[PDB]
Amino acid sequence: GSVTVPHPNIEEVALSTTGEIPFYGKAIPLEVIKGGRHLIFCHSKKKCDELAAKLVALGINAVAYYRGLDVSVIPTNGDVVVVATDALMTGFTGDFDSVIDCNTSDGKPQDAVSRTQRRGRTGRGKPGIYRFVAPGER
């Protein structure tokens, strides 16, 4: 079977209906992406376009990264939140306060390594926070 490695360095959270940015039957409270740098994992490219631009309207600098996307994320200054699928990778990431994921890829439930690779992003120097959606998963 698949055995994902643990990770006490990151705090696991359950995304709920609380906030202003709606996201898959869930409401991301800006307190999870606003206030610093955060990475949001999406399963659709069309959502990355609205979800990122919408954040700029909320007051957060958000970027959407995916296959065929231009370098726009800026993790060097200004609270920027990166919302991308598996295109941003993690060659230069790690400086994130938390990662909001939908635990689902292309509509299907994320795979064992998906959260393993997705969780490994926040917690580089401090305790990273990770909020997942999980419609019928636990």
Side-chain angles (χ1 to χ4, degrees):
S2 264
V3 296
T4 46
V5 21
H7 33 228
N9 306 63
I10 288 186
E11 180 192 310
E12 286 151 81
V13 192
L15 196 81
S16 81
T17 40
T18 321
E20 244 93 329
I21 174 172
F23 178 67
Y24 297 134
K26 286 296 197 289
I28 273 183
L30 287 200
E31 59 108 335
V32 307
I33 66 150
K34 172 67 210 224
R37 286 123 147 129
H38 289 270
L39 176 77
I40 305 183
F41 271 124
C42 270
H43 70 69
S44 52
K45 206 155 291 122
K46 278 118 131 138
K47 181 74 94 187
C48 270
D49 282 290
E50 307 242 310
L51 195 289
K54 186 238 224 268
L55 241 29
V56 168
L58 268 301
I60 303 184
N61 187 103
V63 179
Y65 213 97
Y66 44 69
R67 204 162 251 222
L69 197 281
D70 310 279
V71 298
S72 295
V73 181
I74 46 158
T76 184
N77 270 112
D79 295 27
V80 58
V81 289
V82 192
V83 314
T85 178
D86 287 48
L88 186 114
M89 222 83 266
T90 160
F92 63 93
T93 189
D95 220 57
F96 293 68
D97 270 281
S98 89
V99 259
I100 289 83
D101 211 314
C102 193
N103 269 26
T104 37
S105 60
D106 224 342
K108 301 127 209 245
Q110 66 164 344
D111 54 66
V113 307
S114 230
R115 60 211 305 227
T116 312
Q117 204 212 73
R118 278 165 130 117
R119 201 162 243 108
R121 250 131 220 214
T122 185
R124 303 240 174 191
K126 68 263 171 146
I129 281 144
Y130 190 112
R131 287 159 144 280
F132 65 80
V133 162
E137 214 88 81
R138 243 139 213 256

